[PDB]
């Protein structure tokens, strides 16, 4: 019955987030990254077709409709999904939960649960209403798993560093508690009776105690740092090693930033796996002991301190949501201002040509002001929080001193006990303060752990691979396509029912315009993507029933888009071989005539190059010794078919072999 709202982990998870929210509403919880692959989410976002297809696959009966502005006064369905134009620049997907007079409940993944007036909602709703109904086969169940336990499982290898930290913290707390009675002894037993020698002895003893306390603080702080670095390195390495194995759909369905930014979440996971667990273990016992001693000293002062810490806790956990929302708004405004600045600097020639210096200056000025408004909002929130906390702390201290003096006037308690209580107040207020302050860390790291676990739970390329066979024979002869059609997600198909033979050991080439998609055929040949319907045959034993290593070792492909990795040219030319080298490349330098090009740098060294160049890629493919080789615009080799050269413009190669046009119109 609760209005489920799912935060979007990336900048383009809107459709995935709303579909996950709908699934959770009806009792079906799934990992988000397993949803934004059935929805076919891309770098540009998801369309209504992707949402409909994913809902159908999930069991939801889904339909689309272009609802008018007068049919909203009815009951289509309760959890319906709608398309709204956020601000006046971008599209977005939201969930409209309840329709009421002049109030509409909207689960927006970016913001949260918000209330929009019906007339106010009509100003951004540009005809969404994807209708979802429970299908005849909709099996509920929690298909995700807790991830904080999964990343806490990284602590088991280190069970003699957490224990040492725990013992050091316990003895540090004991030493501090023992040393906090110095003022009581000073003003209750020594100053009053004028004992000079005992003064020196006790002062030296307490100085030694404090020195031991600090020494235990120096040894404990190193272990915490080492634990944090170990957990961080383990998490980052595991995540990266798993990512480098995911299929190619993952890499082209996400931006590079969306993949790199997952490294920063390992820090949050470590912070709430090492820091939070250690604080929970230590400060709980520390606060219990401190409260016990405070009650031993005086009950009323302990009650006053408990009231103080309760008021502080309430004040801290009432300004929790506003600070987060203000920070999010500031981040959004800063991102907008930065994007505007990048666009203005990059397109300086157009601005200068058309005399828009003053117009763009005014437009940027109006964007800095919007950042300042939200910055002042967070400043106001922080100042209010600080003022309330300071009022509570100072008034509590004054009341504690007042009540302690009043007790000292009476028979119970003494001034030395009052100073001892003042010293002990730092060992009961700080632990509870930390246990209350742990909440943002826990929330942020739960989000981060979910973010990393979504990727880490994705099946790799080898996992989806079909069973291999006894086709260790190298791929050569009559590359057959049977009714192959391809899609790049849930977008428009690029390939549709193409059949061709590719005779063995020929100079076969394929010609077409930019939109034909010959590189799509090349990528389908290398098993980068699988055909949507059909199969690829190479003289029997279709391409889907053989190992991937033979695929990657024999279908070397070189195109215009050459990527040079920053490193040694010997390692760049011979990349991934990890075998005999430093000689064969030389022949590959001679065979492709790349020796002349590389024998001009006046260092004869790694040639880092700081990241034309098609020749280097050509020499890279020579080391592979491929039985199938593809070119875009860039020979010799032997009887094996090593030329599937692409052709964009006509007459680039007029007489080499049979020519295929777009969609295989003619041979």
């Amino acid at each position: 019955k609760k209005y489920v709202s799912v935060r979007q982990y990336d900048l383009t998870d809107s459709g995935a987030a709303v579909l996950s929210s709908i699934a959770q509403y009806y009792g079906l919880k799934m990992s988000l990254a397993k949803i934004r692959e059935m929805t076919g989410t891309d770098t540009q976002g998801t369309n209504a077709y992707g949402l409909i297809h994913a809902a159908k696959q999930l069991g939801f009966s889904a339909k689309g409709v272009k609802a008018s502005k007068e049919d909203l006064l009815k009951d289509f369905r309760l959890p319906a999904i709608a398309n709204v134009i956020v601000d006046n620049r971008l599209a977005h997907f939201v969930v409209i939960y309840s329709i009421k007079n002049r109030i509409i409940t909207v689960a927006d993944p970016g913001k949260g649960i918000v209330r929009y007036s019906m007339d106010d909602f009509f100003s951004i709703w540009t005809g969404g209403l994807v209708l979802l109904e429970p299908g005849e086969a909709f099996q509920k169940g929690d298909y995700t798993q807790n991830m904080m336990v999964k990343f806490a499982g990284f602590l088991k290898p280190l069970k003699k560093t957490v224990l040492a930290i725990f013992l050091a913290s316990l003895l540090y707390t004991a030493l501090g508690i023992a040393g906090s009675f110095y003022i009581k002894f000073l003003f209750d037993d020594l100053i009053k009776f004028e004992k000079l020698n005992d003064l020196h002895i006790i002062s030296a003893g307490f100085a030694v105690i404090f020195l031991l306390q600090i020494f235990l603080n120096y040894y404990r702080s190193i272990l915490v740092t080492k634990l944090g670095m170990s957990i961080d390195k383990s998490i980052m390495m595991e995540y990266y090693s798993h990512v480098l194995k995911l299929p190619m759909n993952f890499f082209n369905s996400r931006k590079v930033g969306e993949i790199i930014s997952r490294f920063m979440d390992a820090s949050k996971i470590r912070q709430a796996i090492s820091g939070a667990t250690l604080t929970i273990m230590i400060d709980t016992i520390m606060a219990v002991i401190g409260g016990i001693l405070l009650y031993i000293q005086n009950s009323s002062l302990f009650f006053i301190s408990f009231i103080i810490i309760l008021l502080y806790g309430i004040i801290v956990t009432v300004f929790n949501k506003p600070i987060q929302n203000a920070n999010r708004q500031i981040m959004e405004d800063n991102a907008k201002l930065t994007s505007a600045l990048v666009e203005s600097v990059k397109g300086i020639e157009t601005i200068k040509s058309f005399g828009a210096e003053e117009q763009t200056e005014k437009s940027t000025r109006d964007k800095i002001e919007t950042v300042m408004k939200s910055s002042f909002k967070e400043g106001m929130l922080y100042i209010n929080l600080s003022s309330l906390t300071g009022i509570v702390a100072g008034l509590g201290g004054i009341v504690i001193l007042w009540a302690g003096a009043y007790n000292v006037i009476k028979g119970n308690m003494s001034g030395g006990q009052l100073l001892a209580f003042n010293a002990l107040l730092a060992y009961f207020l700080t632990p509870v303060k930390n246990l209350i302050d742990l909440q943002p860390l826990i929330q942020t790291a739960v989000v981060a752990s979910n973010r990393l676990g979504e990727i880490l739970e994705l099946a790799t390329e080898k996992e989806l691979r079909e069973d291999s066979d006894d086709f260790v024979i190298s791929l050569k002869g009559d590359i057959e396509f049977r009714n192959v059609d391809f899609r790049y997600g849930l977008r428009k198909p690029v390939l549709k029912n193409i059949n061709l033979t590719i005779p063995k050991g020929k100079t076969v080439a394929i010609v077409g315009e930019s939109g034909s998609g010959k590189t799509t055929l090349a990528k389908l040949l290398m098993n980068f993507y699988s055909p949507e319907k059909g199969d690829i045959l190479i003289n029997g034993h279709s391409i889907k029933n053989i190992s991937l290593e033979l695929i990657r070792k024999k279908i070397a492909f070189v195109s215009q888009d050459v990527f040079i990795f920053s490193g040694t040219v010997k390692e760049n030319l011979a990349l991934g071989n990890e075998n005999v080298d430093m000689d064969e490349i030389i022949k590959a330098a001679k065979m492709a005539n790349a020796h002349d090009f590389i024998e001009k740098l006046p260092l004869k060294y790694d040639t880092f190059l700081n990241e034309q160049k098609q020749r280097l890629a050509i020499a890279r493919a020579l080391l592979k010794k491929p039985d199938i080789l593809i070119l875009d615009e860039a020979y010799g080799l032997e009887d094996d078919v090593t030329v599937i050269i692409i052709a964009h413009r006509l007459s680039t190669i007029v007489n080499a072999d049979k020519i295929y046009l777009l969609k295989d119109g003619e041979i």
């Binding site: 976002g45 409709v65 272009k66 599209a91 977005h92 997907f93 969404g128």
Partner: peptide, 20 residues
């Protein structure tokens, strides 16, 4: 089953965009 009116089609559902 429709109960809303103006059912859409894939040829028209494709151009509907709910991206970034």
């Amino acid at each position: 089953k429709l109960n809303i009116g103006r059912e859409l089609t894939d040829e028209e559902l494709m151009e509907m965009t709910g991206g970034s």
